[PDB]
Design a protein around this motif. Structure first.
Motif, PDB file in Angstrom:
ATOM      1  N   UNK A 101       0.831  -1.207   0.000  1.00 53.28           N
ATOM      2  CA  UNK A 101       0.000   0.000   0.000  1.00 53.28           C
ATOM      3  C   UNK A 101       0.866   1.258   0.000  1.00 53.28           C
ATOM      4  N   UNK A 102       2.043   1.191   0.624  1.00 52.49           N
ATOM      5  CA  UNK A 102       2.993   2.299   0.629  1.00 52.49           C
ATOM      6  C   UNK A 102       3.480   2.714  -0.749  1.00 52.49           C
ATOM      7  N   UNK A 105       0.790   4.987  -2.197  1.00 52.79           N
ATOM      8  CA  UNK A 105       0.857   6.284  -1.543  1.00 52.79           C
ATOM      9  C   UNK A 105       1.994   7.134  -2.117  1.00 52.79           C
ATOM     10  N   UNK A 108       1.330   8.378  -5.573  1.00 48.68           N
ATOM     11  CA  UNK A 108       0.432   9.521  -5.645  1.00 48.68           C
ATOM     12  C   UNK A 108       1.102  10.796  -5.144  1.00 48.68           C
ATOM     13  N   UNK A 109       1.981  10.668  -4.157  1.00 50.57           N
ATOM     14  CA  UNK A 109       2.739  11.832  -3.697  1.00 50.57           C
ATOM     15  C   UNK A 109       3.726  12.295  -4.761  1.00 50.57           C
ATOM     16  N   UNK A 111       3.216  12.137  -7.994  1.00 49.59           N
ATOM     17  CA  UNK A 111       2.376  12.873  -8.940  1.00 49.59           C
ATOM     18  C   UNK A 111       2.090  14.283  -8.447  1.00 49.59           C
ATOM     19  N   UNK A 112       1.832  14.464  -7.154  1.00 45.79           N
ATOM     20  CA  UNK A 112       1.609  15.789  -6.584  1.00 45.79           C
ATOM     21  C   UNK A 112       2.849  16.671  -6.738  1.00 45.79           C
ATOM     22  N   UNK A 115       3.257  17.816 -10.316  1.00 45.35           N
ATOM     23  CA  UNK A 115       2.336  18.915 -10.573  1.00 45.35           C
ATOM     24  C   UNK A 115       2.849  20.209  -9.945  1.00 45.35           C
ATOM     25  N   UNK A 116       3.345  20.119  -8.716  1.00 47.98           N
ATOM     26  CA  UNK A 116       3.896  21.302  -8.050  1.00 47.98           C
ATOM     27  C   UNK A 116       5.068  21.901  -8.821  1.00 47.98           C
ATOM     28  N   UNK A 122       1.997  20.223 -16.484  1.00 50.64           N
ATOM     29  CA  UNK A 122       1.465  18.942 -16.023  1.00 50.64           C
ATOM     30  C   UNK A 122      -0.038  18.897 -16.290  1.00 50.64           C
ATOM     31  N   UNK A 123      -0.396  18.713 -17.557  1.00 51.17           N
ATOM     32  CA  UNK A 123      -1.767  18.729 -18.050  1.00 51.17           C
ATOM     33  C   UNK A 123      -2.542  17.476 -17.640  1.00 51.17           C
ATOM     34  N   UNK A 124      -3.870  17.504 -17.690  1.00 48.98           N
ATOM     35  CA  UNK A 124      -4.647  16.299 -17.383  1.00 48.98           C
ATOM     36  C   UNK A 124      -4.218  15.075 -18.172  1.00 48.98           C
ATOM     37  N   UNK A 127      -0.884  13.934 -16.713  1.00 50.27           N
ATOM     38  CA  UNK A 127      -1.139  13.263 -15.446  1.00 50.27           C
ATOM     39  C   UNK A 127      -1.655  11.843 -15.657  1.00 50.27           C
ATOM     40  N   UNK A 128      -2.589  11.667 -16.596  1.00 50.91           N
ATOM     41  CA  UNK A 128      -3.183  10.358 -16.823  1.00 50.91           C
ATOM     42  C   UNK A 128      -2.111   9.324 -17.165  1.00 50.91           C
ATOM     43  N   UNK A 131      -0.209   8.540 -14.069  1.00 54.40           N
ATOM     44  CA  UNK A 131      -0.963   7.715 -13.127  1.00 54.40           C
ATOM     45  C   UNK A 131      -0.836   6.244 -13.508  1.00 54.40           C
TER      46      UNK A 131
ATOM     47  N   UNK B  31      -9.448  15.932 -14.730  1.00 50.63           N
ATOM     48  CA  UNK B  31      -8.289  15.101 -14.417  1.00 50.63           C
ATOM     49  C   UNK B  31      -8.726  13.720 -13.929  1.00 50.63           C
ATOM     50  N   UNK B  34     -10.019  11.456 -16.732  1.00 50.50           N
ATOM     51  CA  UNK B  34      -8.952  10.914 -17.579  1.00 50.50           C
ATOM     52  C   UNK B  34      -8.095   9.895 -16.845  1.00 50.50           C
ATOM     53  N   UNK B  35      -7.734  10.177 -15.591  1.00 51.33           N
ATOM     54  CA  UNK B  35      -6.827   9.319 -14.844  1.00 51.33           C
ATOM     55  C   UNK B  35      -7.498   8.057 -14.308  1.00 51.33           C
ATOM     56  N   UNK B 103      -7.655  13.218  -4.568  1.00 50.30           N
ATOM     57  CA  UNK B 103      -6.304  13.190  -5.131  1.00 50.30           C
ATOM     58  C   UNK B 103      -6.185  14.160  -6.301  1.00 50.30           C
ATOM     59  N   UNK B 107      -3.885  17.489  -6.842  1.00 54.38           N
ATOM     60  CA  UNK B 107      -3.019  17.721  -7.995  1.00 54.38           C
ATOM     61  C   UNK B 107      -3.294  19.085  -8.621  1.00 54.38           C
ATOM     62  N   UNK B 110      -1.933  21.832  -6.463  1.00 51.36           N
ATOM     63  CA  UNK B 110      -0.474  21.851  -6.550  1.00 51.36           C
ATOM     64  C   UNK B 110      -0.013  22.590  -7.802  1.00 51.36           C
ATOM     65  N   UNK B 111      -0.751  22.400  -8.889  1.00 48.12           N
ATOM     66  CA  UNK B 111      -0.387  22.890 -10.208  1.00 48.12           C
ATOM     67  C   UNK B 111      -0.666  24.386 -10.351  1.00 48.12           C
ATOM     68  N   UNK B 117       1.778  25.636  -1.725  1.00 51.55           N
ATOM     69  CA  UNK B 117       1.640  24.189  -1.564  1.00 51.55           C
ATOM     70  C   UNK B 117       2.861  23.543  -0.923  1.00 51.55           C
ATOM     71  N   UNK B 122       0.049  20.847   2.162  1.00 52.24           N
ATOM     72  CA  UNK B 122      -0.285  19.572   1.526  1.00 52.24           C
ATOM     73  C   UNK B 122      -0.925  18.646   2.556  1.00 52.24           C
ATOM     74  N   UNK B 235      -1.146   0.372   8.087  1.00 60.50           N
ATOM     75  CA  UNK B 235      -1.892   1.114   7.075  1.00 60.50           C
ATOM     76  C   UNK B 235      -3.389   0.842   7.247  1.00 60.50           C
TER      77      UNK B 235
END
Ligand code: HEM
Ligand code: HEM
Ligand code: HEM
Ligand code: HEM
Lengths: 146, 282, 146
Positions: A101-102, A105, A108-109, A111-112, A115-116, A122-124, A127-128, A131, B31, B34-35, B103, B107, B110-111, B117, B122, B235
């Motif tokens: 599970x880590x 996590x 996903x972090x 990906x954030x 984006x930052x 970092x368009x949709x 991102x897809x 992902x 987003x 799509x994702x 999520x 994102x 963040x963007x 952020x 966060x 977890x």
């Protein structure tokens, strides 16, 4: 997984702009901050008492380079992720005892963090594509668990 | 719970969002679609092409509700009550999807918020969106007096076998969901292991205590909440796997008592126990 | 999908004893009672307001027969679940609009019903084999979603 050619190029194109050592430490740092139960593996790293202690921790930064460099190398083998990560999978289960599970996590972090770092770039659809890749890497690292 | 610091961080961040909240709302859905294309199954009646008025309108309504939530962060259940009713009784979105939209909103922020952020912000935003999601799914199914009665009836019938059934539940879990074994590297996990029997009895005893204090579970379980959050650090997804395996165990041992209505009451009780045990994680 | 000889033998033997008619209606009924938001797909089944109403609903029983029948024919093709369920995957996405998360929920309730019906015979290793199968069938049914 299996990406289209346009998704591969998008993943590859952005990745050429990443500072692997910086982003690796930032994504690991935010994992530890946002989901503090993940700190359970890293008690030997020293001070993790606040977000700045974490983001400023040299052992966190070093581990950041380590994991994201292996990741980066895996982008070169997107057609054979399970095969590329088989040994690492065995290690994380048998020796490190990391709940898969880590990996989701952390995916996903990351990906954030992307984006930052890249903002509007970092368009949709970009991102897809990412992902898919982080889910694929998580799945491949979880593959040898028994 | 949202710390006082968390609330300060959300307000600062959402204030920055300002008059863009709607646009960002529409972006987060685009987003998500799509994702995570399975989320499109809840919008078959929508034109989902980029920039569609339906999507923009959805983004704006969702954005208005979050603003509402932020402005009433110390009274969220009441602030969003109409919205919780609507999702629970009409829309009936599976709860997993709330995690996916959260999520994609993260994102999106963040963007658009490079300066704001930070790691701590966060963290606070993530906690806030999880709190909203909890509120929005809270009325999908508090234990009613019927649930309480059903849980005491079935657990009363477990009785002295509580410990043996807890052990069986862990054994079922370890075989069915091998990843859970990562938390017990120091155990002999073979069938019959006294270490697994000891784990089973301790969990069983804790559940007996929770049944006895079904109206005051946070306090009765407070020391265990501490232990899992700060030391064991399991977890949260794993609690759902053990809960399923306890249900299977009860079903195989209580043929007469495990009716549909009692099964539903037990599933709600274990989810509530699970909520209490993970409540101090963050 | 892959199962040890032991796993497939366990699955096969138990399934010989399953009344598909009854178990299918029981499993769907409990899904509707335990996770009532799933009722969103069955608005035309009429009255599902109470457990007793759900369990004795004739359309629930009849549909129960329907889905577990297709599930059973799946158990005859455990080596090609994706090819087996391809058409139904498409149907559930494009026509029925069913969130794939529901396949996992129904999978778990079926396991609960098998345990309830068979008691002590539904041992931890037999459950383990059935959890693999239900996850593989859910994955096969979600495969063609887009
Ligand atoms: C895609 C995600 C990941 C990749 C590619 C990855 C990769 C690696 C690599 C390359 C190593 C070193 C292996 C060696 O020593 O030969 C390692 C070690 C380790 N990883 Fe992972 N890892 C990932 C995620 C995680 C996560 C999420 C956690 C825990 C929260 C974790 C915990 C550890 C630990 C505890 C070590 C040992 C470090 C040491 O002994 O200094 N890993 N990882
Ligand atoms: C932070 C989480 C969420 C918030 C604050 C939220 C809020 C809202 C609001 C305010 C409405 C409109 C109410 C009205 O017009 O009467 C709405 C509608 C709706 N929501 Fe939620 N929502 C959330 C998450 C989700 C998720 C995760 C999904 C599905 C993937 C979803 C699906 C829907 C649907 C299908 C509608 C109806 C749209 C229409 O037909 O116009 N919601 N939501
Ligand atoms: C709602 C279910 C649960 C309850 C009520 C519960 C309760 C307990 C109790 C009473 C203890 C012993 C504390 C003491 O020594 O006083 C314990 C320990 C522990 N729990 Fe939980 N637990 C639950 C879920 C889980 C799950 C799902 C996992 C992991 C998959 C887990 C992992 C552990 C571990 C690793 C220990 C310590 C074992 C040792 O080294 O002795 N628990 N739990
Ligand atoms: C083990 C998983 C499942 C299998 C193998 C399965 C199989 C089937 C089959 C064979 C049909 C008949 C189609 C026809 O002849 O028109 C069907 C229809 C349907 N399924 Fe699935 N199903 C499964 C799970 C689900 C779940 C979890 C839901 C929703 C919660 C669902 C909802 C429906 C609906 C709404 C219909 C149409 C009913 C009607 O037309 O009266 N299915 N399914």
């Amino acid at each position: 997984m299996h990406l289209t050619p346009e998704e591969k190029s998008a993943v590859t194109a952005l990745w050429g702009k990443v500072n692997v050592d910086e982003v690796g430490g930032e994504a690991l740092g935010r994992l530890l901050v946002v989901y503090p139960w993940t700190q359970r593996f890293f008690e030997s790293f020293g001070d993790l008492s606040t977000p700045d202690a974490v983001m400023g921790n040299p052992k966190v930064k070093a581990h950041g380079k380590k994991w994201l460099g292996a990741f980066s190398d895996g982008l070169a083998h997107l057609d054979n992720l399970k095969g590329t990560f088989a040994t690492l999978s065995e290690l994380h289960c048998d020796k490190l005892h990391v709940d898969p599970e880590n990996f989701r996590l952390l995916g996903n972090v990351l990906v954030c963090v992307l984006a930052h770092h890249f903002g509007k770039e970092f368009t949709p659809p970009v991102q897809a594509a990412y992902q898919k890749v982080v889910a694929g890497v998580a799945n491949a690292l979880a593959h040898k668990y028994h | 719970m949202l710390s006082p610091a968390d609330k300060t961080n959300v307000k600062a961040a959402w204030g920055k969002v300002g008059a863009h909240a709607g646009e960002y709302g529409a972006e987060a859905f685009e987003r998500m679609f799509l994702s995570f294309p399975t989320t499109k199954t809840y919008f078959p009646h929508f034109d989902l092409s980029h920039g569609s008025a339906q999507v923009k309108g959805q983004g704006k309504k969702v954005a208005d509700a979050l603003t509402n939530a932020v402005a009433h962060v110390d009274d969220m259940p009441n602030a969003l009550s109409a919205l919780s009713d609507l999702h629970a009784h009409k829309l009936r979105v599976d709860p997993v999807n709330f995690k996916l939209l959260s999520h994609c909103l993260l994102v999106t922020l963040a963007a658009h918020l490079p300066a704001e952020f930070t790691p701590a912000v966060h963290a606070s935003l993530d906690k806030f969106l999880a709190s909203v999601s909890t509120v929005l799914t809270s009325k999908y199914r508090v234990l009613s007096p019927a649930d309480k009665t059903n849980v005491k009836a079935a657990w009363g019938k477990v009785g002295a076998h509580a410990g043996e059934y807890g052990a069986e539940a862990f054994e079922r879990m370890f075989l069915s969901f091998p990843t859970t074994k990562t938390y017990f590297p120091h155990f002999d996990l073979s069938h019959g292991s006294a270490q697994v029997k000891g784990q089973g009895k301790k969990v069983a005893d804790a559940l007996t205590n929770a049944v006895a204090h079904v109206d005051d579970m946070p306090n009765a379980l407070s020391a265990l909440s501490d232990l899992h959050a700060h030391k064991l650090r399991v977890d949260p997804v794993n609690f759902k796997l053990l809960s399923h395996c306890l249900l299977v165990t009860l079903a195989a041992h209580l043929p007469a008592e495990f009716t549909p209505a009692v099964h539903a009451s037990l599933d709600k009780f274990l989810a509530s126990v699970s909520t209490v045990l993970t409540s101090k994680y963050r």
